[PDB]
């Protein structure tokens, strides 16, 4: 229950619950399998 | 982008990698496999130590230098004392295995040499006094140490001449076993895969042992101008598919 | 739901004879021998549950920090001008006792922090300070001043209330294990010199405390009593109740030449 | 004795056998680990679980 | 770093030996690098023995 | 949802040797150079999330 | 024609037959089974050497006499020489294991005497000398000879008080932990089944011992007239379900 | 009604009304019937 009018002023958000590391560990533009050659 | 050339083993908790192979050999077309019922005579259980034996044991290394004549690993003395798989062939009467071999040796492009590594099944060991000279137990269970070739001839040792394969067969026909060369300007490594070859399902450990390893060099050594004159080789053998049976007291052995 | 009603009875078939040999105690009843009427239990055995029995308030820890001016002091810690307590259940004996009536025990601890002052010498009044709990789990900077950068707790769950109030908050079960240990036969390692008994399996942080206020005039003393209450509780094992007297935190030691703990009979074997 | 650049290279010697080229323990909270994101990051929590990945690049 | 708690140890060897080409000498390096496997958990936030202050900063 | 069960392997096929040079960070795992057992994470990764790191 | 007085328990290549058991403990009633993927932590896949090490190990026998306190085992220590259950014992990094324990010990119908032979989880013993003083490490592992609760104080070493459970708790309380008695006038051995118990799946075998074992006489010996006046007590205990992972060098432990 | 998030904070559990006295007292690996003799 929210007691008040604005959006500021509710609790902590929740968890994102969306991680995805690939734009960190992996932002290589041509794909790369695990298992293939690094370098062909 | 597979090449025969790259390759990874994992066995256990240990793994090799190599990025210079040349394919790898299976004995007699054949991979290790555990002893079926049918072939069974022993009515006891086995034991099969499974990961705690079936992993990677690295050999302390040799050095190669142009004067080498080869060097010779009796399985599964050669293992004798890595970790538990030592301790369950001391500890039990009857044992059986099938193992992955890696011999390893890199130089560059400039050096030269080619090495012969063999499984020899059954290598009967001559004595180099000739007659009817037994070689004693303690000569043909040299351990990690394994033998050297180039060593000098000792009293009850076998004969060490490199062109009879010490026991009156001549070098170039020990094609004939399963092998593979490792020559730097194409090879770095050699695996061959021993299945378990003997005319009984299981015997003994200690008494008997039941393939030669022999890594010999057959082109010498060349290195480049002012390199050393001299590369390792080591060599890392797993036991694969072992199981133990008749339990008790622990062997005793001859020194 | 306690006794069924039972009659005379002359057979071969004896409830009452066993053999204790076995480790079993036979689930044995009055109605086995003696003739009985029917009872009913009107009873439930809720206060007996173990959440019931570990989940009160018990006092854990009574400790102490002054407000006084730090002006000219080598060491707050030494001057009660701040304190630390590292978390424990095994200080005061009376919730230990409890608790170690089981070997495992798993729980949420709620903890209540009174805070009461006193001013044993002089002053034109009472002042109204603010204490702060800090809890500090294992690797955090530890407090050296009452008022370094520690107590900023960016990170650290920090609370602040008010001298003669209560602060109360609830901690989940910080445990490494699925358990804490109530007992432990082993070391850390394998050293030929490591402590026995004590472990980390047991271990539920450490929590420092200090007045927020600077100092006034006099010199105002506060004592920390903090309390905690064991909720969701679970425990296994049970094991025979302490009968010598505690003399360590963590360790099983009783202290020698102790009393002989069964009562001597003023008479014989055959006294009532 | 003070940060450089070099303390991020581990020396490798032509033609040593058998030797042993480095050696440390696993406290990720500590030592070499300590100033590295990872163990920069775990300091900001008391209790790790899980698997580490080691890897050495060849120059 | 917590004795009970601790994780072990890492260390390298040479198993056959480094090898330079010819015309070529000294020493080589190899760098080396630490991340987490997905596997990975980390609990109980606190405070980072990594940073600490005496006055507090100004503009 | 940590570690799937997986046995000897000889292959061709070598997941353990990459080239950092590429920027990337190969997603490497215990199973894919040791033997493993089948173990589950029991646990989401809550208390790091940012809103829970910067939310004190 | 069974009773519950006659019993065999054959585990590996080891059989035990009581003619006069008095039923058997298993503790908490639970079974040693292995360590489900549920509750496992530790991705390493373990090893089960089965046959091997799941056999009966009689440890070195005790004398019952007028005097006798009791005597106090811890496991898996005592077992850390046993065969090939030992070895794996120094040679992982974690280990479990349940157990059968057979404690024996015949009289004949003029002798009377009661042992009281009890299983306690996690026994963490107290110094003798008070206060916070530890008990060191050799102290409680004293491998298959046990501890001998008649036996003097030492130092470093735990109180050997038997009224108080070497812990500061009563002997007459002990019940509470899966028990049986061996009355000479009923019973001749006991025997109790251990389930792992402990608060992590898996654990170090070297730094923490998770029962103790202990044989207290109770009833006191007394033997027919002109009988020698003592009894020997033998302890056979057999690793059940057992299971090993993290193998590597092999643990160095105090003393 | 929980006020709170999270599940500790939530008050005393409610009666395991679980009960079962037989893992302590009556481990045995044969089963005993009462009546019948301990010792067959």
Avoid at chain 5, 5 to 33: D, H, K, M, R
Wanted: charged share 20%; proline share 6%.
């Amino acid at each position: 229950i929210n007691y008040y009018k604005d959006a500021a002023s509710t609790s902590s958000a929740g968890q994102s619950l969306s991680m995805d590391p690939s734009k960190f560990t992996e932002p290589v533009k041509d794909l790369m399998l695990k298992g293939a050659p690094a370098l062909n | 982008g597979y090449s025969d050339r790259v390759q990874q083993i994992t066995l256990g908790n240990s793994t090799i990698t190599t990025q210079e192979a040349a394919n790898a050999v299976v004995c007699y077309a054949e991979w290790p496999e555990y002893l079926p019922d049918v072939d069974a005579s022993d009515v006891n259980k086995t034991s099969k130590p499974d990961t705690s034996v079936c992993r990677f044991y690295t050999l302390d290394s040799k050095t190669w230098t142009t004067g080498s004549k080869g060097w010779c690993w009796k399985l599964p003395d050669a293992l004798k004392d890595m970790g538990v798989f030592g301790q369950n062939m001391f500890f039990h009467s009857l044992g059986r295995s099938g193992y992955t071999v890696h011999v390893q040796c890199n130089a560059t492009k400039f050096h030269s040499g080619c090495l012969l590594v063999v499984v020899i099944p059954e290598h009967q060991l001559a004595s180099h006094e000739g007659g009817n000279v037994s070689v004693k137990y303690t000569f043909t269970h040299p351990g990690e140490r394994g033998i050297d070739l180039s060593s000098a001839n000792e009293v009850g040792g076998p004969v060490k001449d490199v062109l009879y394969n010490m026991n009156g067969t001549l070098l170039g026909n020990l094609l004939i076993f399963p092998h593979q060369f490792i020559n730097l300007r194409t090879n770095n490594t050699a695996t061959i895969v021993i299945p378990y070859i003997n005319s009984v399902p299981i015997d003994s450990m200690t008494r008997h042992n039941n393939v030669s390893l022999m890594v010999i060099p057959i082109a010498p050594l060349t290195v480049p101008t002012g390199a050393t004159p001299s590369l390792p080789i080591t060599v890392t053998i797993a036991p694969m598919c072992t199981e133990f049976s008749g339990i008790r007291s622990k062997s005793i052995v001859p020194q | 739901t306690a006794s069924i009603s039972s009659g005379p009875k002359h057979t071969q078939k004896v409830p009452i004879l066993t053999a204790n040999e076995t480790g079993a105690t036979m689930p044995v009843l009055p109605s086995d021998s003696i003739e009985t009427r029917t009872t009913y239990m009107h009873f439930n055995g809720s206060e007996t549950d173990v959440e019931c029995f570990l989940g009160r308030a018990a006092c854990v820890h009574v400790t102490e920090i002054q407000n006084k001016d730090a002006t000219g002091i080598d060491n707050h810690r030494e001057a009660k001008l701040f304190n630390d307590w590292k978390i424990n259940l095994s200080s005061l004996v009376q919730l230990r006792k409890k608790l170690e009536l089981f070997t495992y025990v798993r729980f949420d601890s709620e903890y209540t922090i009174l805070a009461t002052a006193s001013q044993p010498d002089s002053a034109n009044y009472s002042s109204n300070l603010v204490v702060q709990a800090m809890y500090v789990p294992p690797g955090a900077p530890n407090p050296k001043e009452w008022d370094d950068y520690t107590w900023q707790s960016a990170s650290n769950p920090s609370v602040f209330f008010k001298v003669g109030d209560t602060s109360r908050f609830s901690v989940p079960y910080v445990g490494l294990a699925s358990a804490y240990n109530c007992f432990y036969d082993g070391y850390s390692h394998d050293d030929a010199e490591t402590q026995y008994g004590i472990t980390v399996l047991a271990h539920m942080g450490s929590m420092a405390f200090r007045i927020v206020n600077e100092h006034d005039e006099h010199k105002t003393l506060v004592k920390i009593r903090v309390y905690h209450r064991a909720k969701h509780v679970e425990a296994w094992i049970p094991r025979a109740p302490r009968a010598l007297p505690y003399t360590s935190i963590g360790r099983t030691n009783y202290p020698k030449n102790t009393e002989p703990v069964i009562k001597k009979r003023k008479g014989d074997i055959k006294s009532y | 004795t003070k940060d450089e650049v070099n303390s991020y290279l581990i020396p490798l010697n032509a033609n040593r056998q058998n030797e042993q080229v480095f050696g440390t323990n696993l406290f990720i909270g500590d030592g070499v680990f300590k100033t590295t994101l990872l163990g920069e990051i775990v300091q900001y929590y008391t209790h790790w679980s899980g698997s580490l990945r080691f890897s050495l690049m060849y120059t | 770093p917590d004795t009970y708690t601790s994780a072990g140890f890492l260390s390298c060897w040479y198993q056959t030996s480094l090898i330079l080409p010819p015309e070529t000498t000294g020493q080589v390096y190899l760098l080396s690098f630490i991340s987490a496997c997905p596997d990975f958990k980390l609990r109980l936030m606190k405070d980072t023995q990594t940073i600490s202050q005496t006055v507090a900063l100004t503009e």
